[PDB]
Amino acid sequence: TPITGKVTAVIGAIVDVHFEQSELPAILNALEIKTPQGKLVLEVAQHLGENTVRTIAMDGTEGLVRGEKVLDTGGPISVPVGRETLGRIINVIGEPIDERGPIKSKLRKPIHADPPSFAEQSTSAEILETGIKVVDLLAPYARGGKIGLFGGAGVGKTVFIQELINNIAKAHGGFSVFTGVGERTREGNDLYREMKETGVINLEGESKVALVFGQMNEPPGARARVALTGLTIAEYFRDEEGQDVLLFIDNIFRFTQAGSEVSALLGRIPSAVGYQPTLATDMGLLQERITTTKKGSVTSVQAVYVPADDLTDPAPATTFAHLDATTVLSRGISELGIYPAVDPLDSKSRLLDAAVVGQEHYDVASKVQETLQTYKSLQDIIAILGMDELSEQDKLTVERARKIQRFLSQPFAVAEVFTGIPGKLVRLKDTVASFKAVLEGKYDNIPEHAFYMVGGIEDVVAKAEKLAA
Amino acid sequence: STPITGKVTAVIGAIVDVHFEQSELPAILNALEIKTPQGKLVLEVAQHLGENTVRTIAMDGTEGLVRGEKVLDTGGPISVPVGRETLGRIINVIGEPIDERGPIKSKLRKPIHADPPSFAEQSTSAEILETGIKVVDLLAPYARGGKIGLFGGAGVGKTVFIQELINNIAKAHGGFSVFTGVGERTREGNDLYREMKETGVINLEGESKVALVFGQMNEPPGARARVALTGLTIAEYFRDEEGQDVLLFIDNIFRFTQAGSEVSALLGRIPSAVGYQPTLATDMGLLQERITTTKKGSVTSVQAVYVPADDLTDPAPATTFAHLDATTVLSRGISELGIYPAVDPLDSKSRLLDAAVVGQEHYDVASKVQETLQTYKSLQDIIAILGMDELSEQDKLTVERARKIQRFLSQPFAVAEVFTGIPGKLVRLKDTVASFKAVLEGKYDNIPEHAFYMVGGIEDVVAKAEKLAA
Amino acid sequence: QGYAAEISARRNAMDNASKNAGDMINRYSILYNRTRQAVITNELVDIITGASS
Amino acid sequence: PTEVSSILEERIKGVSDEANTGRVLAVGDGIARVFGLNNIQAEELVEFSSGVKGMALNLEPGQVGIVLFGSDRLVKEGELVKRTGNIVDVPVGPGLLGRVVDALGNPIDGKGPIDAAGRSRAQVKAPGILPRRSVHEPVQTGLKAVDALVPIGRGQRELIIGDRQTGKTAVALDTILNQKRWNNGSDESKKLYCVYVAVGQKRSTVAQLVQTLEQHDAMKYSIIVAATASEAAPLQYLAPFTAASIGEWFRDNGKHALIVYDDLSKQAVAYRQLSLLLRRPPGREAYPGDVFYLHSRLLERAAKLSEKEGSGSLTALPVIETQGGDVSAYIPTNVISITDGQIFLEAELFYKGIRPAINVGLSVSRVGSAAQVKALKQVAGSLKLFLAQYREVAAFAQFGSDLDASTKQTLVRGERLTQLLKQNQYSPLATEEQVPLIYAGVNGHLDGIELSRIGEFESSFLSYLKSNHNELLTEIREKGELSKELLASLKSATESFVAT
C-alpha cells in the first residue's frame, strides 16, 4: 500500500520528511505532496537518521505546513522517452507543458542513471564542418563529440548556438534534443516559434527535435535537475533506437550554480568561492553521460556561462576537461564589434591535427596563430609607443594580423537583426585557401576594413572595389 | 612496574584521542606508546579535552588503529639518547636509530621539549666565522656562535649552499655537529650520509664528528613537527654538558612551521592569516630561543628557510627573520642569471658588518660594492629605454664596474660540480676584500666581464683573462 | 634642418608616450584596487569558514 | 569447448558455507555515519549489505565515518554494515602489463581477471635514507628540448606543470612511446615499464589515449589506472597510491617503472571533497590541512634503490594544472617544492610555435647532467645557459636600436637553436638522431641557413647520416660517448652536408 511521510521541516528549497516505520524511501526517489494546485515533487537527497529524510523540492515550497502528509512514489523522477516526445515541450519532471495533452510513450525512465562504462567507450576523429570560419579553420568540431561555448554575459553563446542549430540541425536528418537550463523563457518561447516555422517541429506532421525547459525562473531543485531529463531522453535515442542525436544544452552552467544555491541548506561546509564541495563529481556524473558509445553517436553543443567573466572560476575551470572542442567568447572582442567574438588564441579542439585536417589546413592554422600571437605580444609597445616604434617585419605582421583578425568575423544569418547584412556561410576548403592567400600577403594592398564582416575571400575583393568607389 | 593505561577513543587522521581513569591524566607534551604488530606507535599529548580525555598527536601513521586499544604512559616527553654515543648514528624523531647499526648505547636520554635559557644566561660576542664563500664573507659575514638563516624559494640553491657550508666549516671545526633533516628529500639525506663517510666526517669503524637526525617529508605532520627538537636536544647536550662548540644544521626549518600548520585545525584551532596556525609566532619563538650560545658553551646554526611562493612577506619566513644574526637571501632573479650562489647582495645582511668588528676598510669596501650595485640597479630603467648610450661617463663606468662585480660574487662550489663541471674554488676572506678593493678603484677596468664569472680569487680573474685572450 | 626636425619629433613622440602611460596608469590603478579588495574578501572567507566549524 | 557454460556452474557451486558490524545512522553525499564496527581499523575496508564498498576514515567515539566507493542510492539508514578486516590494497606483478584497471585494480578493459604475483597496500612507507643510490641512469624521452635541457633520471621525480591545454599530457605520452626502443629488446635492466594514472579525466579521454598507446604498440609495457571524472571521490584520491604500488613492484624486483600522475590538482580536488563532507575543518582554499602531506608521501615513494636492494628504480612524472599561469597558488607551490625539478609549459610559447612549449627559463632538472647520456652532455655543453643569454639579447632587441656583430651573432644562433628544438608530437628521437642535430646547432653549422628551412634541414640531415655515416650513428648509440675521433668524423660529416 502507499508509503506516507510527514513534513517536519521547510527551509527554502529543502523539505524534511519523517516516515513512520522502517522502510525509508531510497536516496534519489521522488516524493509527492498533494497541493490545491496539482502536486509538489521532492527528491530524497539524504537520510538524516532517525527515520527522517531530507529532500530537495522540484518546485516552490510556499505554503507548506509542518506535519503535512507526503507520499512516497517508490522511484526516481520519470520521463517519457522515445519517439513520442518529438515536438513536445517537457518539464523537469517529464511532463507536457505545451498545452497539448499526455505524452503517450511506452516507457518512463529515471533521470538518474550511471554513465556509460569504459568498455562501452567509442572514439573516432571525424570533422563536422560548421560553415563558421573561426571554428572550421582553428578549432574544428567533431561529429559525435562534445562541443562547448564559453563566455560571459552577452558575448553571444546563445546566438552562436542558434547559428549551429541553423546549419547542422537542418541537414542532419536524425533526432535533436534541445534543453533550456536556466535561460530566458522569452528565448524558449522564441525557439518554439522558430521551429514551427522552419518545420523542424510540425504540430500536424512529424518532428525532428524535442524540447525540455527548466528556465531561470525555476527554483534551484528544478534547475539542478532539468538537464538530467533532457539527457535521459537523448540517451534513449542513442542506445535504444541507435540514432545520431544532436543535443544542445543552454546553459549548462546553470546546473552547477543551482547545486550551490541549495548546498548550504543541505548542511555542507562550502568550498572555494562558496561552491558545493561536490562540484567536480556532480559534474562528472552528468557530463560523463553526455557521450558517444558503441551503440550510438551523440554530438552535443553546450553553452557554458563564465561567472564574472573569470575563466578560472571553479565552475568553468572544471568543465573544460569534459569537452572535445572548446570555443571561448571574449567580451573585449565583441566590444571590437567582432562576431562571432571568439578567442582565436584560446579556442581548442582535438581535431586540429594534420592526421585529420591535413598538412596545409594544419599549417595555415599555426601560421595564422603565430601572426595573432605576435600582434598580442606587441599590444603593450603599440599601446604606449604606437606603431612608429615597431620594426619593419613587426609592422607588417600587425597590419596582417589586424586583417586576419577582422577576417575571422563572419555575418550570421540568425544575427541579421544586429548586423543588418544578410548572413554568410563559408566552407572549410574555402576558408583555408582564403586565409593562406592572406598569409602569403596576396592581399596586403587592401584596406583592413574590407576584411571585416564578409564571407570568403571573394567577398573581400568585392567590398574593397565597392569602397574604392 | 607502576604502569598507566588508557584506551583509544577516536582517530581522525593524525589526531588520536585517548581516555584514562579518574584524574590521572598524563600531562601535556608527555609521550604515550601503543604496541603495534610492527614496532610501536608514539603519541604526544596535546590537550586535556576534559572528562578524562586527552587529544594527542601521532609520531606516525594512524591507519590500523582500533578504538578501545590500550595506550601506555611513558611518564614524560619524547626521549632521545644524548652525548657522544649519537656520533656517527642516524636518528628518527623518537630517538631510535635508523642506520641498522644496533642500539644507541648512551648513558643518558633527554626530553626533547626543554626550556629556553634565561635572559641572564645569554652570551653576546661579535666573533666572525670565515665561510670561504666570497659574497657572505664580504657582505653579510657569518658570526661564530651566531644563528644564520638561508632564505630561498624552491630550488634556488639552499640545500646545495648548506652542503657547501658543511663541506668547509665542518672539517675545520674542532668540536661536534648535528644535522637535522626536517621534511626534506629522503634522497638528500641519503647523499649526506654517503658524503659524511667519504669526507671522513663519519667513520663507522672509528671516530665520528657528527650526529644525524632525520624526519623527512615522507613522514606525517606530528613526526615532521618534533624532529627539529629531537636534533636540537642532541646539540643542546654538547653545548651544555660537553661544554663545547657545536654546529647545528637544520634543513629545512620552514617544515617545522608547516607541520604545525597541518594539524592545527584537527586540534580545533581557528586558522589565522594565510591559513597559518594561531601559534606561529610563539611556537617558532619557543624553538628558536633554545638554539643559542650561552655561558656554558656555544652553538652556531645554519638553518635553511623555505620562502613559499618566493614570497618573503609570507607570515612563515617573515617571522623567522627576527631570529637570525645573519640572513642570506637567495634570489631567483640572481640564479636565473647563472650567478651561483643565488645570493642577493643587497637584501643579505649580517649584524657583524660594522667597522668595530671587521675594520673600516672591510666595511668601506663592503659599503661601496653595495652602492655600486644599487646604482646599477637604479639605472636599469634608463638602460632598457634609452640604451647604454644615454649615460653620464661616471655612470657608464659605475655600470661597467657593477657588472664586473656581479660576476665576481659568483663562485664554483665543490658540492655543485655536477652542475658546473667546474672544480670547487674556496676563497680566503682577506683575498675577498683585497680583490674587491682593487676592482673598486679601477685597477682592473681593462679585463672583460667573463673573466670574473665562476672563478675564485683575483688570481683566477687574471688567469682566465689571459687564457681566454689566447 | 634634419636634426632640428628630429628633435621636434622626439619631443612630440615622447610627449604622447607620457599621455598613454598616463592613461594606462589610470586603468591599472583601478584594477589594482579591485584585486586588493578581493584579496581581502577571499582571504577573509577562508577564515570565516574555518571558524564556523 | 564442449559446453563451456557447464564448467562455470560446477566451480561456483559450493562457496557460501561459512558466513554466520555496525548499523547505518545516516547516509548522504558519499558519506555514511555508522553506529558500531567496534574492532575496525582506521582506513579499513567495509562492505555494505547492499554491495557497495567503503572506507573508514573517522573513527569517532559514538560512531564511524565512512566514504563510499560507490553511489549511495543503495545505502539506507539501518542497513547492516560489515567489517572486511583489511586495509585498502591492490594486485601487483607483471600481470598488470597491458591492462586498464580502476582504483582498486579491477579490469575495466574487458580482458578478464588480473593475474597477480601478490598484493601491496595503497599506503606504503617510502624507502628510507638507507636503501638508496644516486640517480645515474637516463630515462630518455626522445624530446630534443627535454633530453638536452632538463634531462630526467631513473629514480627522480619531475613535475610537469603549466596551464590547461598546454601539452602537459603530450610530454608524458611522448616519453612513454619512446621506451619501445628498449622494451622490445631482451635486456631487462634497460627496460622502462609505464604506469599512467588517469585522475579526474573523462572516460573517452582515457579511451582516446589507450587507443594511441596501441596505435604505437606501447600498451604491452604500460598499465593505465583509471579514476575517471564520474567515479567516487575516494577512488580518485586513492588511484595514485594504488598505482604507486603497482609500479613499486617493478622497482622492488630489479626493474624500472615510470609513473605518470595525470593529475594531482584533481586528486587534491577530490581529497578536498572527502574531508569537507567528513566535516574535517578546512585549510586554505577549502583544502584540508595536510593536502601537502598527501602528495609528499606519494612522490617520495619514487626512488632509485641501492645494489643491495636490487637497483630497481621508480621514476615519477606528476602533472599539475595551473590557472592564469599562476604557480603561486596553493597546490602547485606544494608539489613544486616536493619534486626534483619542473618542466613549465606555456600557452604564449605554444601559439608562437614553440612545441613542446617548454619554458627553458623556468624548467629544471635538479639531478641534471647525472642522467643525461654522455654524448648528449658533451655537445649540449652550456646550451641551457646560452639559451638564457639569448632571451637576454632578444629582450634588449625590443629597443630596436642597432645591433653589433656580437649580439646579432648570438641572436642568429639562439633563433636557430630555438627552432632546432621544436618537435612534432608522437615522434620521439633516438639519441644518435638528437646528438648530431645538437652538434650542428651548437658548433654553428646551422647559422647560415634560412629559418623556415631548418625544418627541412633536420630530416634531410638525418636521412644522409643514416645513408652514409651510419657507422658513426651506431657508435654514438652503442658507446653513448663521443670519443675525440668521433667528434672528428662528425665534424667532417656535418660540414660536408651543410655545403648541401
Ligand SMILES: Nc1ncnc2c1ncn2[C@@H]1O[C@H](COP(=O)(O)OP(=O)(O)NP(=O)(O)O)[C@@H](O)[C@H]1O
Ligand atoms: N554572432 C553575433 N553577431 C551579432 N551580434 C552578436 C553575435 N553574438 C552575440 N551578439 C550580440 O550580443 C548579444 C548577446 O548575445 P547572446 O547570444 O544573448 O549572448 P549570450 O552570451 O548567450 N548572453 P546571456 O545568455 O544573457 O549570458 C546579442 O544581443 C547580439 O547582439
Ligand SMILES: Nc1ncnc2c1ncn2[C@@H]1O[C@H](COP(=O)(O)OP(=O)(O)NP(=O)(O)O)[C@@H](O)[C@H]1O
Ligand atoms: N608537439 C606538439 N605539436 C603539436 N601539437 C601538440 C604538441 N604537443 C601537444 N600538442 C597538442 O595540443 C593539444 C592539447 O595538448 P595536451 O597534450 O592535452 O596538453 P594538456 O596540458 O594535457 N591539455 P589538458 O590536460 O586536456 O588540459 C593536443 O591536441 C595536442 O595535439
Ligand SMILES: Nc1ncnc2c1ncn2[C@@H]1O[C@H](COP(=O)(O)OP(=O)(O)NP(=O)(O)O)[C@@H](O)[C@H]1O
Ligand atoms: N652553486 C650552484 N651551482 C650550480 N647550480 C646550483 C647551485 N646551487 C643550486 N643550483 C641549482 O639549483 C638546483 C636546486 O638546488 P637546491 O639546493 O636543491 O635548491 P633548493 O632551494 O634547496 N630546493 P628546496 O630544498 O626544495 O628549496 C640544483 O639542482 C642546481 O642545479
Ligand SMILES: [Mg+2]
Ligand atoms: Mg633543497
Ligand SMILES: [Mg+2]
Ligand atoms: Mg592532459
